[PDB]
Curated annotation (Swiss-Prot), chain B:
Gene Ontology CC terms, in alphabetical order: cytoplasm; nucleus
PROSITE patterns given in the database record: PPASE
Protein name: Inorganic pyrophosphatase
The family this protein is said to belong to: Belongs to the PPase family.
Record-listed Mg(2+) 1 binding positions: D115, D120, D152
Cofactor(s) required, per the database record: Mg(2+)
Signal peptide: none
EC number: 3.6.1.1
Biological process, per Gene Ontology: phosphate-containing compound metabolic process
The species this protein was found in: Saccharomyces cerevisiae (strain ATCC 204508 / S288c)
UniProt keywords, alphabetically: Cytoplasm, Hydrolase, Isopeptide bond, Magnesium, Metal-binding, Phosphoprotein, Ubl conjugation
Catalytic site: Y89
A GO term, aspect molecular function: magnesium ion binding
Length: 279, 283
């Protein structure tokens, strides 16, 4: 059973969320199996940002046991701005554990390097998830956002327990049940950084969302890169783990060094984050 | 100064918010001046629902001092559903105090009776307001939603303190600074009840948002209806509680009313059912 250990108050710099497996903290990056069901291609997803929120929370490669913390830009906490007609993130946003986009690898079709982070996942189910949640999702497709010369893949997935999960099998089904969701997703990733002074993002494949088969190839590749990394002969990435004995960095002691859950009430978010930008 | 007196926990049947003027509760419906600045046409708006929320909160006509409380349907709390691509209400939603849409009267250009409530206001500024807040806004235009045979006017306004306020003077300016906002507003009011089993709503004037001048005419009219209402001169007042504490010349004036309202009993927001999360794709 996976649980979360919050330390600090949300919307502050002290905020950290650790994932626990049966009460013991494990690495959010390395210790959660990519597959919940390997033969059926059911994956485990680590949710970082709940739908309709603004705080840019993400798994930290830099810290031990890789807890989820809020991104900062030179001491200032990072929030994504509201871009009409959207409110914060429009999907439960997260990543697939045990995956890594090797920045040394260049994809032939996209012609851009990996982004050095676990592959990104957009979960489109009805329920709003919580930070640090481990959901089991089925992959349906994948888009390729080009950002700063790196291939920023975004897997489209859905919680297997969503009442519609059984009806959705491939990318085409998303447009059947969530008409317009893909166009909005495309729009969102093209403009979300504009309020930050950045220019619009480009999409590979002319913005086409590739299907499940294609998605699965890219996922396996990033899983392999991660295996290469976590294994003996492979940066700044902390590779400490507590569930993989065959790895140079394995360490059960790591779990116990984690300070206890220190749940505090959410700190207020600045009123400027309310603003709706019309781009 | 205007403050709010919360009683109960948000998202519960016990929830109530009273507006206070210098510490004493006043009627949200009758006691707040329609005009903040009569000369320049700056109005006072009572905010009921903050942008991006779902709870259908509104000034209750059938209770003393007319506090804001959550609408209910079949003994259950009422929430508007999320309709793609929108999240809850897309504007800070509220009403103009001292206005009333007389239900025993049909407007000439829309041919339907009034909806029996203060005129509705859509405040489009950047800051998210809070329930029971009294903002000063300038009117820019007005739309006419036809719902159940009643003219449901929606005034388009903006907080006088908004960074872009002076740039906005008439309905055409909204489309210049908030492109697409008006089309989304139309879309939203046409479909928001569909998830509830209701059919889509119709729009008078082919969905055209009338300009400022037109808006001011309708506002004046509803203010007059209210004056005839609060003076005891309405043919049918509809069970509306007319108790007030600031208008001595009215039959229902009563200073004593203020003191009878129970003290602020702030409690932490009750949780909202997960089903409210659902995004409906109505195409
Ligand atoms: Mn990521
Ligand atoms: Mn990425
Ligand atoms: Mn109303
Ligand atoms: Mn109305």
């Amino acid at each position: 059973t996976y649980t979360t250990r919050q330390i600090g108050a949300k919307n502050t710099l002290e905020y950290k969320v650790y994932i626990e497996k049966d009460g013991k903290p494990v690495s959010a990056f390395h210790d959660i199996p990519l597959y919940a069901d390997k033969e059926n291609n059911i994956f485990n997803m680590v949710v970082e940002i709940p739908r309709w929120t603004n705080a840019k929370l993400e798994i930290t490669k830099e810290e031990t046991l890789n807890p989820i913390i809020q991104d900062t830009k030179k001491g200032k906490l990072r929030f994504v701005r509201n871009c009409f007609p959207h409110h914060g993130y429009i999907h439960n946003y997260g990543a697939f554990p045990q995956t890594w986009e090797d920045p040394n690898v260049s994809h032939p079709e996209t012609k851009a390097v990996g982004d050095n982070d676990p592959i990104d996942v957009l979960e489109i189910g009805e329920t709003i998830a919580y930070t640090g949640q481990v959901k089991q999702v089925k992959a349906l497709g994948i888009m390729a956002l080009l950002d700063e010369g790196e291939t920023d893949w975004k897997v489209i997935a859905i919680d297997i327990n969503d009442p519609l999960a059984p009806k959705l099998n491939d990318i085409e089904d998303v447009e059947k049940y969530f008409p317009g969701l893909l166009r909005a997703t495309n729009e969102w990733f093209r403009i979300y950084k504009i309020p930050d002074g950045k220019p619009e993002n480009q999409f590979a494949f002319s913005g086409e969302a590739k299907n499940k088969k294609y998605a699965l190839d890219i996922i396996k590749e990033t899983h392999d890169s991660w295996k290469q990394l976590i294994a003996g002969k492979s940066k700044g990435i902390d590779l400490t783990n507590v569930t993989l004995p065959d790895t140079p960095t394995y360490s059960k002691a790591a779990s116990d060094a984690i300070p206890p859950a220190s749940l505090k009430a959410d700190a207020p978010i600045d009123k400027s984050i309310d603003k709706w930008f019309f781009i």
